[PDB]
Paper text:
GEN1 is a member of a superfamily of structure-selective nucleases (Grasby et al., 2012). In free solution the protein exists primarily in monomeric form, but binds to DNA junctions as a discrete dimer to generate bilateral cleavage by accelerating second strand cleavage. We have now solved a crystal structure of active GEN1 from C. thermophilum bound to the DNA resulting as the product of cleavage.
The crystals belong to the P3121 space group, in which the asymmetric unit contains one CtGEN1 monomer and a duplex of DNA with 14 and 15 nt strands (14 bp with a 3′ overhang) that adopts a standard B-form helix with no distortion. For the original Mg2+ crystals, a single bound ion (M2) was observed, but after soaking the crystals with MnCl2, two bound metal ions were observed. (B) After exposure of the crystal to Mn2+ ions, two bound metal ions are observed. Moreover, the position of the 5′-terminal phosphate relative to the two metal ions in the cleavage site in the product complex is not suitable for in-line attack by a metal-bound water molecule, so the geometry in the active site must have rearranged after cleavage. It is also very probable that the metal ions have moved from their positions prior to the cleavage reaction.
Author numbering: 2 to 84, 97 to 159, 163 to 198, 204 to 226, 235 to 342, 357 to 400, 431 to 465
The structure:
DNA sequence: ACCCACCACCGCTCA
DNA sequence: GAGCGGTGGTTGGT
């Protein structure tokens, strides 16, 4: 649920997460804040195979990707007030990356939408579009390839939907969920959408006046709100159930006090725990000894580089040089510079103090495409010299 | 009596 | 959660 909603509101704009990140950083002069429904992982990460704990290993890699994007994420967990990777390990790993874990009192997607409304986050990444019913304005879904590397997302805009052909707004979709559900039998997304379009989605708190209006409209269709008449659809008395109505209208979410607490404490003083990550990966992935250390260095270095650029907003302690420029399609033509750096020097781990058991040398220069905007923010002098040398 | 377009629903598969 | 074909039902007819 809601089944068939995408044929009504649209499938959504497919867009590079990098583009969303960099555009917001340019438009709003600070990194994008994104609430992530923790329920999204449940079917995406238990598809990885091989090695030790591949499910949380997938989680590790998408966290490194979040670093590379410069996104400030907050992962929201479900609460018990709702009407196989460990939560403990997920939260432990979230802290090691300098990210934020947040426990909803009830359903996470309701909390995520609430956080967005309160200006705690700029957008929501969830299983589906249910977030719109809980007040979300910008909601993201399907963080995946476009495949290979997971670079793109599917963006739904609540205002544009309420204007587009469906005319489905928040209270329209509630009525759809009220009548269709998954409650009137024989109904019915098509009819529910037509009922919503007629404006029956208010529901501004003796409600039986309203109920026998559309009930009259469903069987006679004198206003012509429908393609046909529906004398077969017969409506229960409990309906419209009002517990259900305000499960959407005021879902159980964090207290005002919690909101203002988050408002001062998120984003946190984000810092990646290197030594913490080294122990985690050794314990959980069997990334043991010198090979395991080098493996962590290689994977973590680029994101750690991006992350430290923004955090200052000669310092060649980050970028050793620049050599190219591109507007690749994977980022929807977001200007990137080919950047060099020393992985082990940047991560700050010495593979030597670990036992030894073509290849990759963490002490030699590695290359990475980093968004030009982030580089100008973090290493402005090196970028100007690159621009200077290239007008010759 | 029968056709017909539309639709709601079920079972299916992959996440 | 979300895509597919079947299909049984409803509607408005033919
Ligand atoms: Mn949920
Ligand atoms: Mn949902």
């Amino acid at each position: 649920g809601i089944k068939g909603i995408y044929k009504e509101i649209g499938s959504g704009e497919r867009i590079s997460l990098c583009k969303l990140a960099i555009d917001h950083l340019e438009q709003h002069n600070r990194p994008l804040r994104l609430a992530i429904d923790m329920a999204i992982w449940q079917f995406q990460i238990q598809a990885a195979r091989g090695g030790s704990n591949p499910a949380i290993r997938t989680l590790f890699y998408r966290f490194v990707r979040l670093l590379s994007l410069g996104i400030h994420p907050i992962f929201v967990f479900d609460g018990p007030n709702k009407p196989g990777v460990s939560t403990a390990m997920a939260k432990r790993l979230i802290r090691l990356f300098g990210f934020t874990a947040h426990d909803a009192p009830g359903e996470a997607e309701a909390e995520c939408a609430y956080l967005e409304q309160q200006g705690i986050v700029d957008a929501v990444l969830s299983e589906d579009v249910d977030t719109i019913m809980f007040g979300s304005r910008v909601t993201l879904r399907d963080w995946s390839s476009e495949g290979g590397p997971p670079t793109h997302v599917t963006l739904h805009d609540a205002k544009k939907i309420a204007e587009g052909p469906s005319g489905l707004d928040r209270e329209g979709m509630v009525l759809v969920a009220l009548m269709s559900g998954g409650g009137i039998p024989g109904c019915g997304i098509k009819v529910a959408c037509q009922a919503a379009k007629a404006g029956f989605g208010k529901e501004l708190c003796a409600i039986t006046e309203w109920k026998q209006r559309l009930l009259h409209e469903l069987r006679t269709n004198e206003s012509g709100f429908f393609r046909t008449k529906h004398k077969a659809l017969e409506i229960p008395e409990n309906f419209p159930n009002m517990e259900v109505l305000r499960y959407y209208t005021h879902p159980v979410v964090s207290s005002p006090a919690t909101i203002e607490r988050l408002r001062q404490e998120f984003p946190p003083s984000s810092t990646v725990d290197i030594a913490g990550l080294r122990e985690f990966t050794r314990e959980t992935f069997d990334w043991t000894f010198r090979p395991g250390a080098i493996k962590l260095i290689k994977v973590l270095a680029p994101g750690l580089l991006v992350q430290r650029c923004l955090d200052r907003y000669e310092e060649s302690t980050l970028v050793k040089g620049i050599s190219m420029r591109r507007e690749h399609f994977s980022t929807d033509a977001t200007p990137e510079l080919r950047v060099s750096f020393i992985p082990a020097e940047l991560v700050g781990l010495d593979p030597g103090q670990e036992p030894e058991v073509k290849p990759f040398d963490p002490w030699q220069p590695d290359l990475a495409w980093v968004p030009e905007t982030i580089l100008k923010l973090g290493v402005p002098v090196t970028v100007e010299d690159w621009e200077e040398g290239q007008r010759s």
